[PDB]
Design a protein around this ligand. Structure first.
Ligand SMILES: [Fe+3]
Ligand SMILES: [Fe+3]
Ligand SMILES: [Fe+3]
Ligand SMILES: [Fe+3]
Lengths: 384, 512, 162, 384, 512
């Protein structure tokens, strides 16, 4: 049997005998040298800041010298060359929610188990009985299901960023932004799988919503934007900023909040909103981090504010057009709704909510002159 | 009341449709250079979804942090550990931390490389796991700093690590090797070799030695880390499976594997043997025995053997690796100790029992290393008033210490009982020093991949105390060095003790 | 002087502070890369400080470029006014026409020295890294251990000091 | 300072020396003598069964003799005299969800923390914007608000049972049934408190909903039934059975699921359903335990089945009348809804769902002859 | 995106309106007989709601169960405990378990008594807390059974406790005393006296004795239980506050308090000191000092003093409790040991070091108890082949053992170093035996509240082994007794060993 030094009389006595009288240094605070963002250093910061071994030549790095092994050709492991944005210190970023691995999986796990109990309750409660069949069969199955691919693409857009992020704080935020997206895609399928269990004849195969995504008209420009953001952008910041501060903030928010969350309730559907609640909770959580990185740290950088804002305004313009195109094609879905579901007045107000929120939360932060009426009118152009 | 059986949906039921999530478009391809084609349709072993992944990890965290925060703290477990082990854990936890960290980026790269949704999903879970591991290793140092006998180093390794030479080599195997190169070469360095050959057995061995040395903090955390490793092995296996049916595999796989194998063993062979044998009071097993089982038998034989059906074969450099192994860790500790002022940890000369243990397990140890250590002690290497640093002995005895341009591993050819090979080239106005035929070929074939400045090039003409000072190698009193040549509670060396020695670095290649 | 701050780094931020046009900044950055980066650098005199100095030069070029260029040009033109896509394509085409690994490394390494951001936009540059690196490796990694070291030392052209 | 026997060399040496060679008994299973309900003994059962120190004179007790101290007059601490129901063994009950304290609070905590995040997300997302002001200010505030008193009364009905329950397994289930009820009452107030924070002028004071409960017409018979179930019933089993298998199964399920959960979505309200989801999940969890105790254990008792069913049918008839009166008065709320909100056909369908569900899940288990049409017609008399 | 700051609502914001949840109706009154009136505007100290309560406790649970399942199990903490303490915990955890259990019902009764929603809410938190505590004490026995040195008894105390006389007294103070009577008298037994005077300080003391004896399991659990106790003392304090401004208080409060104080101390004074001093190897503090500090100082002085403004006075029976206290625990252990075959745990005679410790702290201990223990050992009380059980010595030396009709505490007036009082009455054909003036008044004034049959009455005319067999007092082999007169691993007593003694119970009162 194994003898442990903490409990074995012989070994412990030897250990105790070697110990000093008191600690050899009174400074018992790990990352004590890290500049805290708040009043006192947090656990999130201590466990995260400076984990990335950058040298001083990547803004804010504490190490020195070149990397030990680079790519064939000479490209650095991490380098300034992977993004247009510049800063005085890449370690400035702080997720306002202070999420390191432990609290992140803790919360997601709570949502998972509660999701399981909710479904167990919903099915036992027979709440499906009053859900409109047309909404369920056409709208949730095909159209909401098609949206899974949008979120999946947005998830995949983060792959390069996971590899190229220039700091630990940014990498952690980025990974969580991406992981929440795949989760949402999976929750859309989970709902379809649930319907297949409680509704005879309902087919959980992704065939239908996939065909809608790849070949339909309503999500045509959406898919084109996603394919672009994911595979045509090689700058990790352009990807993150454009996905979260342009495309998803406008198109995603409209689709999730202004179409499905707003309309599913009119069809006796409290099922889809249960999952959209998670999606919106996740959107608002990421937003805080997106704003901190792009506005507080980059857009407001003491030495590169002007430069960065120029680049971000550039990306906003670049991605605003395909985003509008995405919303415009999506307007086509309203024509497919049963008569009397909505009207142009409600659609218009919903469009303004999304645009106004985007202007206050994102556009205005970098002095991007967005014309609300101009944007709403362009989208309304696609109603039928 | 109501009607219908309570029903729900699990991970497998959703994962069943995950492969179908990816769709075709012209530019749906990896953003990274690669000689290989990862087959779409490649499947993954673990049928996970994000929510279930979080749940499975959360339960583990619950147990771990519960133990740490309650019982272990009540037991003062952060204190009742052998002084030597408290020091070893500064290096073990922080160096492993960087591998966990770079592994996040590596798997992000692999997620990008994979075209099949399931394969991307497999790499994704590892992305999240490596973040978990980064925070776990960080927590081990956080805990020891908060509750241990010597927080210095544990509390600032992220910046104090930069003063010393051993850190450069760690960056080669667990940072750059994981992310810089063909995605497949990185996967071989990370998963197929790094994790399967070294990390997986090392993590558990570390809990063994820790426990032997009174440390119950490390086993609590490291045993939790090891529960995730199975999925990472699967990712590595899947990498090979994904590229195996393409013509490029026959042409390139085995050389990328051989290069990755050499890369990983070049550092771990001497370093881990050093950390175990010289960083502990109580020993678990001689490293010569351990290395043979881990690398030659377990990995080199069985593990790799399971990949034979995909065209993988034993690294052609395996024989060379075994030959160079035996004395590697002994040769290295001489240098690590000689350069003690550059560390962020405290080191000790082997005591009488250890010298006996070493000789019993490595005949001839005493005649070479033992006598040297005794001479250094006589010269006063432990005493602040001696004015002696072992590096002085190297100079007096014409024993230059070089840094391998490729692996960054320090070596002293004229002294070593191991390899003794040295290759020095001049190219375009710069000289380069190599310690073996494999790394030499790497540089000759890919000089632009290996331009890392060494400690002697950067510190050239600088006086030692000024380097330590600028790089914050001091304890909170702002005068006592973090590093020490002994692990006792007093007679600690100070910056001024170092300054009086007037040790000024020289680039050894300039002798040529 | 120190590791993170010293006389040479000081001398360089002073010289960088004097650049006042995108063209002079971009030229100095390109010349710097030919003179101090890669195994082909003209000199090893700045070995300990070039990485950091280069970054400072890049900042100046970036800032001036964002002010000078209209939005489309910031996305599609190099700091010197060349069409990025044309340079990308022509460089990759030369790489794909390379007859051996020796010609190949020169094309990739040289491309980096001349176009590394902020000269060429990052989107085009990293797409180049993707394409160029692939061919460089395919050529280098074929029969990787066939040439004996004695001959490989001569192919590389090192002066063996031993 | 404090030397601990597990780590102190000298003390551990002494302990180690006194230790036996191997354990003195190989039966290392606590609760090994308890008859497992399932395949193998569960942790839930081991930690719970026989914790109550009953003597053999209370069916299933393992102890002997009288209590050591009784009430003035001689009433026993616990006794057969506190309920009409009889059984072969009061320890037979098992909560199918197997909840002891740890899993119960774990699940509720997840719900609390996710509720907090949901609210943070909802407020940040501006989702109230599309909520109908009348439904918000009148229906949620006053009418749903008033229902909090119904759930609070139901929670209070459990006090005597917490004191009088004749077994550990029944006591733990009973407490959890009651604790969920008070939780729901608090969630109704929580919503009103949230609305007060995000809606200018909304008053979270309970004065309005309380006056609706204590003086309005809609909840009159509901309040009367609650007051009786809580304070006029001195039999702990009559209370739990009549609350869960009669009143709340009919009236509560109608109000929560058929009125608010069904109609709130039609007024752009996904906020109330978020909480009702919790109430319905809780109701369905409690149902399984209520069914196990009253039907599997008592109603199907090998010795007292017929007796217990006679008593439970007696209680059903006793409480069905005031429950129907509760539903009848509640029908008056339909006339207060905006024109076109719902109709007699939907209302009738919803009533039949509740009644049929009740007959299947409760009434039929004891052979109580319920006439679905008679009940629905009796309720519809308060509509038109 | 957003338009409005993220907002939520906390427990206190909801609690602000909780008092208004209760409404007026004719029959809104308590279902329990009581002399008092709890004011309907009574407030509670902790502003909690069900959700927040659950979260608070869930955090505690994860810490605790993490320690138990991870580090403590890895440390084999269930085993490395002194044999005597392993046995003591069978009693300490199971007996405390019934206290937690009945406390659930007690607080249910109190929740029914309270008319103010807030007061009801406070009692409700306790209902749930006591459920938590029941499962916690259960878990301690479950953990020692699963992983410890002697599972018997830990594994079935819920049925094996019924064999012995100490269990009867435990049910009086921690079962019936908590739930049978005026709700206020029950609150005084539970909260004002039980928890405030005994349990709260006891739980902590248990962790100190457990730690001294190598037990790290109990500290982990009992320290967690302790975190909930302040809420309960607030409940007790609130009970007094709620009834103090009504005429009934001046007439009845101090009497119910005095009765509750005597009730609790009568059992705990001898039992706790016995479990601590005789149930341990390593000693933390002599019981005489502890008792004086807990009961006289902390409780009777400070704690009680805080209630003076509500008309509460120190119990009139305090001086009597101190008088009878000194030797109480010593006197009782003689009886518990003499009756060892009736327990569900193993007892040991004091060793030589303990004997010295006992005499040092209790002058006169040796010539009375020391001599008896030495005589019993000489007679072979530890040896299964002796044919001797100490009960026989009592019979031979004419020292009848009686059971107090009220408290159930066993007493031997003719041998006792402490109290020698003995009052025997015949009433309507039955005799009753009392050990003190306070309990005698309780019976005379309330005979129908005290009819508990004692072990000599139930077992009258029965041979010992038949009683042990019927009540399952055996180990899994179906032969060896659970109870033992020594804590060694060999020469364990058997059912046949007891049968051979032919010990037949006699009701001591039949001698009058
Ligand atoms: Fe890892
Ligand atoms: Fe790993
Ligand atoms: Fe308790
Ligand atoms: Fe308590």
């Amino acid at each position: 049997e194994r003898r442990r030094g903490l409990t074995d009389p012989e070994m412990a006595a030897v250990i105790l005998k070697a110990l000093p009288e008191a600690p050899l240094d009174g400074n018992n605070k790990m990352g004590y040298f890290v500049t805290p963002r708040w009043k006192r250093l947090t656990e999130y910061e201590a466990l995260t800041v400076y984990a990335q071994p950058n040298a001083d030549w990547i803004a804010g790095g504490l190490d020195w010298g070149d990397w030990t092994q680079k790519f064939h050709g000479g490209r650095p492991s991490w380098g300034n060359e992977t993004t247009e944005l510049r800063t005085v210190d890449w370690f400035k970023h702080r997720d306002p929610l202070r999420r390191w691995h432990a609290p992140y999986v803790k919360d997601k796990a709570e949502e998972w188990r509660y999701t399981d109990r909710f479904l167990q309750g919903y099915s036992a409660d027979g709440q499906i009985r009053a859900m409109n069949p047309t909404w369920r069969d056409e709208f949730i199955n095909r159209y909401w299901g098609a949206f899974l691919f949008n979120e999946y693409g947005l998830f995949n857009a983060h792959s390069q960023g996971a590899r190229e992020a220039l700091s630990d704080v940014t990498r952690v935020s980025l990974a969580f932004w991406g992981f929440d997206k795949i989760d949402i895609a999976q929750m859309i399928q989970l709902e379809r799988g649930f319907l297949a269990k409680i509704v005879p004849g309902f087919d959980e195969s992704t065939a239908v919503p996939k065909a809608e995504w790849t070949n339909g008209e309503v999500y045509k420009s959406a898919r084109l934007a996603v394919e672009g953001l994911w595979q045509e952008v090689f700058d990790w910041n352009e990807s993150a900023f454009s996905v979260h501060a342009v495309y998803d903030a406008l198109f995603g928010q409209f689709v999730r909040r202004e179409f499905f969350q707003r309309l599913a309730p009119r069809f006796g559907d409290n099922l889809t909103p249960f999952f959209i609640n998670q999606a919106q909770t996740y959107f608002q959580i990421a937003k805080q981090g997106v704003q901190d990185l792009y506005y507080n740290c980059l857009g407001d950088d003491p030495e590169f504010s002007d430069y960065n804002r120029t680049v971000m305004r550039n990306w906003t313009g670049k991605w605003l057009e395909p985003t509008i195109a995405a919303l415009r094609d999506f307007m086509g879905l309203f024509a497919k709704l049963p008569a009397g579901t909505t009207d142009k007045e409600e659609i218009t107000a919903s469009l303004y909510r999304v645009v106004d929120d985007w202007i206050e939360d994102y556009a205005s932060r970098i002095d991007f002159k967005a014309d609300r009426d101009q944007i709403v009118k362009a989208v309304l152009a696609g109603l039928k | 009341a109501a009607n219908r059986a309570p029903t729900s949906v699990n991970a497998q039921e959703v994962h069943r449709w995950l492969q179908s999530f990816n769709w075709d478009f012209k530019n749906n391809r990896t953003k990274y250079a690669t000689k290989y084609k990862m087959a779409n349709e490649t499947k993954e072993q673990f049928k996970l979804i994000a929510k279930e992944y979080a749940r499975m990890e959360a339960v583990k965290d619950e147990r771990q942090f519960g133990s740490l925060q309650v019982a272990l703290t009540r037991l003062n477990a952060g204190v009742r550990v052998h002084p030597k082990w408290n020091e070893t854990m500064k290096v073990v936890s922080n160096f492993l931390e960087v591998g966990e960290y770079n592994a996040i980026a590596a798997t992000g790269m692999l997620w990008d490389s994979a075209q099949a949704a399931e394969q991307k999903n497999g790499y994704l879970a590892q992305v999240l796991d490596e973040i978990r591991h980064t925070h776990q290793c960080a927590y081990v140092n956080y805990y020891f700093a908060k509750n241990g006998q010597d927080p210095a180093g544990h509390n600032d390794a992220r910046r104090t690590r930069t003063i010393g030479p051993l850190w450069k080599g760690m960056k080669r195997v667990f940072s750059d090797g994981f992310i810089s190169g063909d995605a497949v070469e990185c996967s071989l360095n990370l998963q197929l070799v790094g994790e399967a050959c070294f990390t997986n057995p090392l993590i558990v061995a570390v809990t063994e030695w820790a426990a032997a040395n009174g440390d119950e903090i490390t086993p609590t955390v490291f045993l939790s880390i090891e529960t995730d490793e199975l999925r990472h092995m699967a990712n590595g296996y899947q990498t090979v499976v994904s590229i195996a049916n393409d013509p490029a595999s026959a042409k390139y796989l085995n050389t990328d594997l051989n290069n990755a194998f050499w890369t990983q063993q070049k550092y771990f062979t001497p370093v881990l043997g050093m950390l175990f044998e010289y960083g502990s009071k109580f020993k678990v097993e001689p490293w010569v025995k351990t290395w043979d089982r881990w690398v030659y038998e377990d990995w080199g034989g069985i593990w790799i053997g399971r990949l034979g059906k995909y065209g993988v074969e034993s690294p052609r450099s395996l024989k060379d690796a075994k030959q160079d192994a035996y004395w590697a860790h002994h040769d290295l500790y001489l240098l690590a100790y000689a350069l003690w002022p550059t560390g962020f940890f405290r080191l000790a000369l082997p005591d009488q029992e250890e010298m006996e243990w070493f000789e019993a397990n490595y005949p001839g140890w005493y005649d070479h290393y033992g006598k040297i250590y005794e001479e250094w002690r006589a010269r006063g290497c432990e005493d602040p008033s001696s004015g002696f640093i072992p590096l002085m002995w190297f100079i007096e005895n014409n024993h230059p210490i070089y840094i391998d341009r490729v692996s960054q591993v320090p070596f002293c050819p004229s002294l070593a009982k191991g390899a003794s090979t040295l290759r020095v080239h001049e190219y375009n106005g710069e000289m380069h020093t190599f310690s073996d035929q494999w790394g030499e070929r790497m540089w000759l074939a890919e000089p632009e991949r290996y331009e890392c400045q060494n400690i002697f090039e950067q510190y050239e003409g600088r006086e030692l105390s000024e380097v330590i000072a600028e790089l914050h190698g001091l304890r909170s009193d702002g005068k006592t060095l973090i590093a020490q040549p002994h692990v006792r509670g007093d007679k600690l060396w100070t910056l001024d003790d170092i300054k009086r020695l007037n040790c000024v670095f020289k680039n050894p290649v300039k002798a040529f | 002087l120190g590791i993170h701050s010293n006389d040479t780094r000081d001398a360089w931020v002073n010289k960088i502070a004097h650049v006042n046009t995108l063209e002079k900044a971009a030229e100095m950055l390109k010349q710097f890369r030919m003179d101090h980066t890669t195994p082909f650098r003209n000199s090893y005199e700045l070995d300990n400080d070039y990485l950091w100095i280069e970054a400072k030069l890049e900042e100046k070029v970036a800032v001036l470029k964002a002010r000078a260029f209209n939005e489309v040009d910031f996305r599609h033109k190099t700091a010197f006014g060349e069409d990025a896509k044309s340079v990308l394509d022509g460089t990759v085409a030369k790489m794909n026409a390379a007859k051996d690994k020796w010609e190949a490394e020169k094309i990739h390494i040289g491309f980096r020295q001349a176009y590394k951001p902020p000269i060429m936009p990052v989107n085009y540059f990293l797409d180049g890294e993707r394409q160029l690196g692939t061919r460089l490796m395919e050529l280098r990694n074929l029969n990787y251990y066939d040439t004996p070291l004695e001959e490989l030392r001569k192919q590389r052209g090192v002066r063996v000091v031993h």
